[PDB]
Amino acid sequence: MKPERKRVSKLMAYILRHSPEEFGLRPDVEGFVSLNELVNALKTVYPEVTEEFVREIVENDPKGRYEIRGDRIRARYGHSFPVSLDHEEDTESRFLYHGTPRRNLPSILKEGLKPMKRQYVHVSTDKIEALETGRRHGREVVLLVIDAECLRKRGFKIYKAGKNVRIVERVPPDCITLAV
Ligand SMILES: Nc1ncnc2c1ncn2[C@@H]1O[C@H](COP(=O)(O)O)[C@@H](OP(=O)(O)O)[C@H]1OP(=O)(O)O
The missing domain is CATH 3.20.170.30 (ADP-ribosylation fold)
Incomplete structure (x- = not known):
């Protein structure tokens, strides 16, 4: 109930911020992975997780930890791998x-x-x-x-x-x- 959402959320944040590769995931440049792939990755630890459950975690998160865009999901902050959250291009570097x-x-x-x-x-x-x-x-x-x-x-x-x-x-x- 309450502990369910918290333990799944903790894994979600670890996957999305720190090591998507430990679950076979490859974020795009903005840090998103597909929602289905994240569900399948969570399911290896918590088999009861569904896409709807992840969506409710995102909707109800008190800190703004996550963002779903279309059918892709990311953490909004706290990454320990390089990401370009706003897709902002480097045009000046030679x-x-x-x-x-x-x-x-x-x-x-x-x-x-x-x-x-x-x-x-x-x-x-x-x-x-x-x-x-x-x-x-x-x-x-x-x-x-x-x-x-x-x-x-x-x-x-x-x-x-x-x-x-x-x-x-x-x-x-x-x-x-x-x-x-
Ligand atoms: N309910 C929840 N959902 C997701 N993630 C959670 C969490 N409750 C805690 N975390 C994360 O655990 C780390 C250490 O947190 P503490 O033990 O200092 O409170 C830190 O993540 P990280 O190591 O990436 O900084 C926290 O994430 P956050 O800062 O968003 O709470």
Whole structure:
């Protein structure tokens, strides 16, 4: 009744803010997942959850935690992964940066930056922050320099994801150059 809604809501917020990948979910750039996919993910822990139950959680949430648009759902705040909540485009940046561990560099040079268990990749306007973000993934980080105008001309819109972080669907190898 009351504890039911709270325990399901706690899982909902964790999934939507923190680790959609632990449930096989891939949010779009605005942080939405489909309502059906979220229900199926909740159902693995609480089999009694239905779409109507999730809708009532959203409608009755005292803090504005969630938003349903059409048949997709997101958390409105508190994300620990890069999102562009208002879909606001970065049009001014000329160069973006991504740090790749030297071990992962062969596949990235051939294929570019491809999204993995996510719908988009993340890069930075700042080369030092790009290298620090890459260091989290392994040693001997190699700096990739990304031509933002090449990305836009190729049809990839670049979105602001807070401070110096940007997200984009993928980065083709043609928009990438190496640096020490
Ligand atoms: N009823 C509910 N529905 C969803 N989520 C809930 C929740 N009741 C609590 N949470 C979240 O638990 C985290 C620690 O909260 P406390 O123990 O400090 O109160 C924090 O989430 P996070 O770790 O992402 O910041 C809270 O979310 P919120 O701040 O929205 O209540």
